[PDB]
Nucleic acid binder design. Structure first.
Lengths: 293, 289, 285, 285, 283, 288
RNA sequence: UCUUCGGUAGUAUAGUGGUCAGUAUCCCCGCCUGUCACGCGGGAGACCGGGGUUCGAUUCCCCGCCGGAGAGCCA
């Protein structure tokens, strides 16, 4: 009767060894699929700078309003602008093209905008020096807004330019420089990576205002004089590449890991069951050898 | 002729010793290198960024710190493209949810500093702004400046009675920006949600001031009338989220190592079978019958 | 045709399994080759925050013109600058170490460095107050440049300050401070990693100008008094490291091991053809 | 035959001799290992330090108040000075006084200063003192020259520096006159554990001081004291151990193997001799 | 049980590789020790003896002084005092040429060079003497430097360069006024890798007071006196020795290889002896 | 078969001669490097240092040579960095041990130079220091100074005999210092012993004097009167040992030689194995 | 396609339900009888593979691999 119980105990051990590795496999595959779904939930960041040598012509959509473009001189490399007496017009050696459109988010108002061509040569540090004057009024807070878009010649050679300002304000953000300062804007360009098209352009900038010596002007009525430059901070275009360990990585790693752990989950069980039936037969051998020595 | 026997004696010994030596020399090499790589990847968790959109922000924690400065207005201009022109100096129109707390200084435990916490803007979509106005006619420092800090939520401060520790932890964590003394500082703000190992999102603020000079010469400021201005608003509806994820999975480490061990076992067995076959083909070639 | 055609139908499965395994292997190696084409973008960013307590004092290369310093009062303990007076030179207690050399860009211009030690502690908010002065001239906009580099001691200990400062000027950028504002320049470090781990660093800074009342010295010509409050802001430094996510060892291991499941599938094919042969033998016998 | 008894002894004799020389050589090599372990050798190293290494110069005037300091960043001829004028405390006169650690009864003072820098340009501290002449003869002012001024500043519990650095030096003084000029240099010895110790050694060179300027009427004192740096080639000392980590045991095993091989070869050769002797015996039988 | 015997044979097979691992570990340890020994070269000194020292180099920059006596007391120590200030007894091989500064490049240096003493057995000493007019510098001094041999200045050319090179190698010792600075000099030779012998001078001054009461120097004029005896009749010979020789560790590696071969062979013989368990069945 | 026999024999012979040769080349090459290494390490012995420690030094001799002066004051001020100073220039209070010997010179062999031998301080831990105030009449001593010489055994000087030679040899060996005529020469003598070969080690005194000036305001200005103080101490409670070790060991070197000879013998055995492989190849050649 | 016969050291076989899987040759070592074996004395190498019964199966049974033997269309 002892052997009749032993043949049941060893069957129980057989089933235990089978189901141990039949449950480990399912637990591991479920854990791996859950982990790879988690990885699919959110990708990681992969930046690259790809420094350039000759920037494109950028777009600067000023909204001067009632002011006047006194000067838009392009200091081709002159990091120290030639001092000139404020308060009078002159030297419109600029690439301005006054083009207006209706502003969205309002649906009721017209607003003009003298989009100008920005500097290109970062190595030479090309500049653009502006000067806006306005007869003082009740506004008491003189800020002249300005937008920024990547390509200017694209605006030059695009039919139905409605997009170029009816979408810039709806996409970009509206900065503004002060009245009575010289807002030094050191722009830079940053590119993202979307799955729909190819990429996108977003601007960054570091305004560094410096005071304006009101002498030699004497604003008796209070004539404010806006002054703006638009440098190019760096020859580098930090592009954001949103790399994913999500679509191909999940599938490939899933299939490989599972089909290669099934290998052990089968081989170890086979070896263990073979050797345990071997030891069962060995116990039978030793008891029957005690019987028939 | 024992030439075949001697060639066998050379081959099985040297070839098999070489193959079970190269097996170890590759297995231990790869296991050590990949364990080191696992430790390295555990050393440097990779960051994850995205932009979860928010239609309507909560009530932020703008907390002005005016030392003996008189508030003049709180107009929460809901959507105004530019706030309407205001005559300075005159008080009134202070429709801001305001509370004053002052217990102790977190730094040096020096003294009390009263705050003027405002509920702050909510609707980013309609570009809510909370345009302030200040006044410091009686100047003795002669070195103008006004301090302000931001915290996460208003009702979180309001409901919790930990008033002193609110301005303890907020002051210790958030830096102390100071909007300029005299001209309006259009302080757009944005939120950054960084995650932690425990799932806690300890948020911090990010702002991009844009100082606009004032032409407030309608005040006769000869006596020392230095009046300030502030504008808060929410920069973009989006919110940045920061989460550092573990790039190394030990449950993939173990799978990779057991798989390469199985590869090496199969390679050794195949090599043994192949050498046995190449040895035994001459056995059927030396004798024909 | 009763048995020869069946044997041909069995043997075409041999070529079938060969071509299937070839195609699957080619597809898998194509996927892995695309992965190591993405290897170009595999440089990813991993950042950490070293909670540093005591900080290295950094050199602060100011580049004044016709200006003259007035104070360097380092408020090691004080986080607040006590009230002071315009003009009136006093307590030039900094470590001004003028090394005025020629331009590194055009090699013609004259620059006048005034390296200051800067602060050390950040838990105590160690300010480094400064002050300048300039009698008015035809200077329609007034600005006093400056610049930064990694460490003061790396300037003091290293020899040949000529190239040490000349290359640093062109390498970094120059963000100035204005004529009449307390340009409260905070500062912080980003610790990036190069291809080998040389660990170059550059400076992040958040200026915040603030107006200064000038009635106390009645400048009747345009006298300008600058003020700079260089101060370390971050109680911890950011550590940018560009780790790469893929190594060829994983590629070769996974490929050569899915090769084994391919071989096992071939084994099942070789068993199944024999099983079908046995079944057909039983059926047609 | 009798030749068998003749040769049946030197067989075991040669193995006995080999065992004897084996134990002799193992004793010789173990004694050599003991000797080479009991006499570690040193290695001298020169490093070309280019810069500061701020030392914690100390002085113990007690009654001789300071009257001058200087820092001649490049001046091998320090110019004239007024004898007896107090002030110009350009030194970082971090004055601290502490009780004796050794006698535990004397209220000792200190006038720690900041040490010379710029060894390349030979920057040299300079001093000047004064003391109303008292009953004590042989006017002497003790002074230590411990190192690490920069860490001395930030160090906590400054009593320990004074109470400890006295024991680890000999406190060489400077005289009551004639500008005891004091050069100095460093030695960097390596301890047994792995740490290192830095000690200052100095080469005074006194030069007589002309008193044709003070014209004292009592016998007052104006003893200077001058510091500098000697050649920057700081001596690094390392006490390396004789290279016997495992070579002794490996060559012990080698001599073991060769002696066993030689014993076996001796057996082979003597067996060959026995074979040829048996052949000769059969020839001559 | 034959399967057990083959499994023990497989155990010996596994043991066969732990010897390889230990050998490779010892090889790595040996290569690390070799690199360490090539990283810290050892030093040695041998005090050789010299019967007749070379006539050394003595550079002096008196400035506005004037050598009043240059007597070679061959072995006598009796001090003659004719007059503290008179010029006389210039009995030495002296030679002065002024050269511009090789360091500042502006000033000129007046190298009033004196040959010096040779016979250490007789303890030759070159008793100098110098007087200076009163000046405002408030403490007198004379920088003086030494070089290898006066003959290296006598016959050699480029005498301007031959002194200009020896500018900052030494530390510019100096004797004072109203003193008798006794300078016992010794010479140390270092032996570096490139076969050159850089000679250096090391000396131990011992100032002794002087009596000017016999000259009535109330005005403020100071005197100077120097001697330059050679201290020891020896020369320090410091040699840096490399203590690592690859041709002394290749034999170490070979011995390791032989002992591991013997160990493996003994393991094989041990399992062959273990076959006695089957040999008993054969019996 | 003649051609095959000739070619095989020449091929085997050239292989064996090539390896046999190499064997000899590496043997002579290694014995050459052995010769070079052993001769080089015999030429340049390598020296070592160590620092033992004591708390109570023995009594060292101090051979003063006062030509005309006198022991105005001798003391044993231990532990007192402020020695009790009396009125200068007044004799008495000599609480030391002396022996006014007067022996011969090695250079003149005729002068009976005095030597007021004293024993130095011993308590380094309590920094004991002697104090030897003197005075002379300097009628003509324009550069006043009295020599002093250090030997390391006062106790062994006492009980020993032939004291003329016991002072003669120490005078010859150690160089003669001198203390200033009008200063205070603080002499912090350290003790250095070198463990030489021949079963003998010798001691050497090295010291760094530090003159500190003396003020004579307490004595009336006189002609032919300059006094001077000399101080002896103990620098460190250490004793530096300079011992020379030897790098080369004949036992180790012959061990290397035996190992490489074993390796080359095994290489020749593998050459013999190649010979037997050639023999079997020739057996196959004749079988075919 | 079907039906038998056999498969063992490197060679030839002999063994078989309970074990010096043996022997001759071949492989190694001691003797040199004129010789590197012409002759002796000691030591060494194996059940075609897989599964199943049996205390144990190289033996008993089944399935695959290898030959050789026959009918032979398997076209």
């Amino acid at each position: 009767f002892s052997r009749t119980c032993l043949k049941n105990f060893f069957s129980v051990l057989l089933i235990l060894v089978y189901l141990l590795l039949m449950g480990v496999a399912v637990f591991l595959v479920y854990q791996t699929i859950t982990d790879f779904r988690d990885k699919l939930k959110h990708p990681v960041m992969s930046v690259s700078y790809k420094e350039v040598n000759m920037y494109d012509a950028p777009g600067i959509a000023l909204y001067p309003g009632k002011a006047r473009l006194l000067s838009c001189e392009h200091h081709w490399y002159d990091h120290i602008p030639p001092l000139k007496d404020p308060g009078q017009p002159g030297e419109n050696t600029c690439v301005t093209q006054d083009i207006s459109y209706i502003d969205p988010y309002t649906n009721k108002t017209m607003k003009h905008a003298l989009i100008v061509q920005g500097p290109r040569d970062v190595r030479r540090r090309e500049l653009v020096f502006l000067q806006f004057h306005l007869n003082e009024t009740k506004q008491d807070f003189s800020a002249i807004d300005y937008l920024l878009f990547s390509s200017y010649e694209a605006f030059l050679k695009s039919h139905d330019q409605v997009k170029f300002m009816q979408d810039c304000e709806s996409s970009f953000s509206s900065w503004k420089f002060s009245g009575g300062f010289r807002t030094w804007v050191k722009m830079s360009l940053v590119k993202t990576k979307e799955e729909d098209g190819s990429q996108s352009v977003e601007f960054r900038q570091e305004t560094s205002v410096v005071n304006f010596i009101d002498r030699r002007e004497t604003p008796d009525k209070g004539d404010q004089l806006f002054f703006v430059v638009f440098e190019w901070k760096d020859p580098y275009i930090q592009e954001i590449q949103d790399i994913i360990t999500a679509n191909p990585w999940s599938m490939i790693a899933l299939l490989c890991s599972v089909f290669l752990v099934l290998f052990k989950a089968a081989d170890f069980a086979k070896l263990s069951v073979k050797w345990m039936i071997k030891v069962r037969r060995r116990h039978l051998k030793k008891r029957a050898r005690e019987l028939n020595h």
